[PDB]
Write a protein that binds this DNA or RNA. Structure first.
Ligand SMILES: [Ca+2]
Ligand SMILES: [Ca+2]
Ligand SMILES: [Ca+2]
Ligand SMILES: [Ca+2]
Ligand SMILES: [Ca+2]
Ligand SMILES: [Ca+2]
Ligand SMILES: [Ca+2]
Ligand SMILES: [Ca+2]
Length: 294
DNA sequence: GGCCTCCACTTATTCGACCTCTCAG
DNA sequence: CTGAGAGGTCGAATAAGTGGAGGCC
């Protein structure tokens, strides 16, 4: 395998990767609970390469199928979690996931002292799990009532580097060739779109993208209860003089790099105005088709 | 015995990706 | 006519999670 730049790896960990803390009822321990702390990243089968290069970069973690179409990288071996702590202490996360890392860091110290084998240590872990990701199940809520959960700090940090954004984009980014039917002679408009999806927790971070990249805007989407944000750039001059030069200097990792490469091919056709012709339009449809089924 | 670590595989919901239209210059 | 938003839809490569058990000191 090949190494991954640490900042690119952190950025990819802001977009992918989830900390996890298992607190299960268990008959084969005195305290009656089985604990499992770790970190994981789940991608499509086609992107198993990233996991292998991560596994080789950190020298930690195990790979396993995640259903019929996906695979994951899991790090739960306790001694291997030191690498995860060492990496993120030097290359910290900047999304709200950094608050989950801190809770993960606290759980590590409880288990490091072996306090998870006691009833008090478990209670401490439960107070931490209450604020980690999706909190506690009602089964444990009623099991450990009147527990003062730990406080979850609001993360509001600046983008550290451009490499961080390359990794974050590879995880939650998208390079799309928009074909828009138009009641006109040619019939269709071509328009490149660069976007980054993200939960509305990080509205601050998302908004700062406009300031950091000097272009784009924000779009608030809602699916009933749930809402998230999209950082979107469509103005071609910005895509040509900002987005494209940026990601040529700071390589994307995974299958998204292939989409970026075809994306840039369409940008070339557009610079030459070949997107107003007919032969050029067949070319753009071929490139776009190669990005959907590919 | 007591406890750790891994594979199988799912759920909820947060992404990615896919549209189509208005309208000013 | 064209470009740049405006205004969306939608399915799971979503982010997060669980059951089962082989493995080790
Ligand atoms: Ca993400
Ligand atoms: Ca994922
Ligand atoms: Ca190792
Ligand atoms: Ca394996
Ligand atoms: Ca492991
Ligand atoms: Ca260190
Ligand atoms: Ca992704
Ligand atoms: Ca332009």
């Amino acid at each position: 395998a090949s190494s991954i730049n640490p900042w690119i790896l952190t950025g990819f960990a802001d977009a992918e990767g989830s900390f996890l803390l298992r607190i299960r009822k268990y008959s084969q321990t005195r305290v009656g609970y089985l604990t499992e702390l770790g970190f994981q990243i789940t991608l499509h089968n086609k992107d198993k390469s990233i996991l292998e290069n991560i596994q080789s970069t950190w020298g930690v973690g195990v790979i396993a199928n995640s259903g019929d179409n996906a695979v994951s990288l899991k790090v739960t071996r306790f001694e291997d979690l030191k690498v995860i702590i060492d990496h993120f202490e030097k290359y910290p996360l900047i999304t709200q996931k950094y608050a989950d890392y801190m809770l993960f860091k606290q759980a590590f110290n409880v288990m490091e002292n072996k306090e998870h084998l006691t009833i008090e240590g478990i209670k401490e872990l439960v107070r931490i799990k209450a604020k980690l990701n999706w909190g506690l199940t009602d089964e444990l809520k009623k099991a450990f009532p009147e527990i003062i959960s730990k406080e979850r700090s609001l993360i509001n940090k600046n983008i550290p580097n451009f490499k961080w954004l390359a990794g974050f984009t590879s995880g939650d980014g998208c390079f799309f060739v928009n074909l828009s039917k138009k009641k006109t002679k040619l019939g269709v408009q071509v328009k490149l779109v660069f976007s980054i999806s993200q939960h509305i927790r990080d509205k601050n971070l998302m908004n700062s993208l406009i300031t950091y990249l000097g272009c784009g805007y924000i779009k608030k989407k809602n699916k009933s209860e749930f809402s998230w944000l999209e950082f979107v750039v469509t103005k071609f001059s910005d895509i040509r003089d900002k987005i494209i030069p940026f990601f040529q200097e700071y390589t994307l990792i995974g299958t998204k790099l292939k989409d970026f490469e075809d994306w840039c091919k369409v940008a070339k056709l557009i610079e030459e105005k070949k997107h107003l012709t007919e032969e050029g339009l067949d070319e753009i449809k071929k490139i776009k088709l190669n990005m959907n089924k590919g």
